[PDB]
């Protein structure tokens, strides 16, 4: 198979520059007339094509971006780059790299995406509160920034995060049989990579 993995600073302050990398595995980015595109998706799901670089190093931009974005490659690392400066909050989005279809200008293989948040706000790790009374358990995750938390439990719903005076709140529930808990241990591990924090809250009766 062919996999594309994006990486880059999640939180960048306005004005400054975002630099993203797309590492390709399973095919060479110099092979067989393929083109590689960058595509972003804004909150609210609008999609915007940004530009492409071909297997032979030809680059074409979206004309509304050409003044402030650069696409390059490092073939010895099988990587493609996206640089963009003069940043506003309008540039907060999920940034994808994609291999174009064989006939070009449509997008057949996508990376998992990497979100960039353009904000002046400080990074803040979450507080995690257990929600204890089949039986439903939960964890409330409050007061973190930027967005990007994942909950895992040692039957699960993840409710979307709500913004409130600069800080996000979300919650997650899990359902288990009433013989299982509190006999067995249930724990919600919450990860917030922007603050490099993990909270493993055990649910107590």
């Amino acid at each position: 198979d062919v996999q594309l993995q994006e990486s880059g600073p999640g939180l960048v302050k306005p004005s400054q520059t975002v630099s993203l990398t797309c590492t390709v595995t399973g095919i060479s980015i110099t092979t067989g007339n393929y083109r590689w595109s960058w595509i972003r998706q804004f909150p609210g799901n609008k999609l915007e094509w940004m530009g492409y670089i071909s297997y032979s190093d030809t680059i074409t931009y979206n004309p509304s971006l050409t003044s402030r974005t650069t696409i390059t490659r490092d073939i010895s690392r099988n990587q493609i780059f996206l640089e963009m400066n003069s940043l506003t909050a309008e540039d907060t989005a999920t940034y994808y790299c994609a291999r174009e279809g064989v006939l070009h200008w449509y997008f057949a293989v996508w990376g998992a995406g990497t979100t960039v948040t353009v904000s002046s706000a400080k990074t803040t790790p979450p507080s995690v509160y257990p929600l204890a009374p089949s039986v439903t358990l939960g964890c409330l995750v409050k007061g973190y920034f930027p967005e990007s938390v994942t909950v895992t439990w040692n039957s699960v719903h993840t409710f979307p995060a709500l913004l409130q005076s600069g800080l996000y709140t979300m919650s997650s529930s899990v359902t288990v049989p009433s013989s299982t808990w509190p006999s067995q241990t249930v724990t919600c591990s919450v990860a917030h990579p922007a603050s490099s924090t993990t909270v493993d809250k055990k649910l107590e009766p």
């Binding site: 799901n45 609008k46 999609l47 915007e48 094509w49 074409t60 979206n62 004309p63 509304s64 994808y96 994609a98 279809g101 006939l103 070009h104 200008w105 449509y106 997008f107 057949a108 996508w110 990376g111 998992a112 995406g113 507080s127 509160y129 257990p130 929600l131 204890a132 009374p133 089949s134 439903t136 939960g138 409330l140 409050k142 719903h157 993840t158 409710f159 979307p160 709500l162 409130q164 709140t169 979300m170 919650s171 529930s173 359902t175």
Partner: protein
């Protein structure tokens, strides 16, 4: 070139037909080839290509997806729709630079009505220690999405400080879930005793009432 997609959302029963239209601004057909493409996107995932050049099915995509149209009018047909089809569908043209995308059409699946499973939770002692008091109600695995949740403190209804959040339609069972959070200061929370979240939903004439006492 701008593409307009109708409708904004579509509700379809299992096995039925889903029809999605994409209206361009100019012709995008070269008398033979048409420069139209369709994608499927599920929440938390990148778009997936379904159809390229108006009518060609991508490898590994089921034949339940059919693309059609020419000039300015393009159609995606999903026949029959399955439960895994709940997603947002996008059209995209490759006629000039830049390629541009429709705004998307949300496809929701119709299923049999299901009552919510309701749970209420007091604030944790850890939250109370740090000064705040969130009372949380979960309403899980229900259908249709329409639901009414009201909070009563000591028998009387309340409105200020309630925040609701909905999941997307679950791709496995087509149900919805929601969280309802009643935010209060510790002081306010301590000077009251009974807390109740009441769910009204079309699946029952009587509401679902979950409560706890601060003792």
């Amino acid at each position: 070139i701008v593409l307009t997609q109708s409708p904004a959302s579509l509700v379809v029963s299992l096995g039925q037909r889903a029809t999605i239209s994409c209206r361009a601004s100019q012709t995008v057909s070269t008398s033979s080839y048409s420069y139209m493409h369709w994608y499927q996107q599920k929440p938390g995932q990148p778009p997936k290509l379904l159809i390229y050049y108006a009518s060609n099915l991508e490898s590994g995509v089921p034949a339940r997806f059919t693309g059609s149209g020419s000039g300015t009018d393009f159609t995606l047909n999903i026949h029959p729709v399955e439960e895994e089809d709940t997603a947002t569908y996008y059209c995209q043209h490759s006629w000039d630079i830049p390629p541009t995308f429709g705004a998307g059409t949300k496809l929701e699946l119709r299923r049999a009505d299901a009552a919510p499973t309701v749970s209420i939770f007091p604030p944790s002692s850890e939250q109370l220690t740090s000064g705040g008091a969130s009372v949380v109600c979960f309403l899980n695995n229900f259908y249709p999405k329409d639901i009414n949740v009201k909070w009563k403190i000591d028998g009387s209804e309340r409105q200020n400080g309630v925040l609701n959040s909905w999941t997307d339609q679950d791709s496995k069972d087509s149900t919805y879930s929601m969280s309802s959070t009643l935010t209060l200061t510790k002081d306010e929370y301590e000077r009251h005793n009974s807390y109740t979240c009441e769910a009204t939903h079309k699946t029952s004439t009587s509401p679902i009432v979950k409560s706890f006492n601060r003792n």
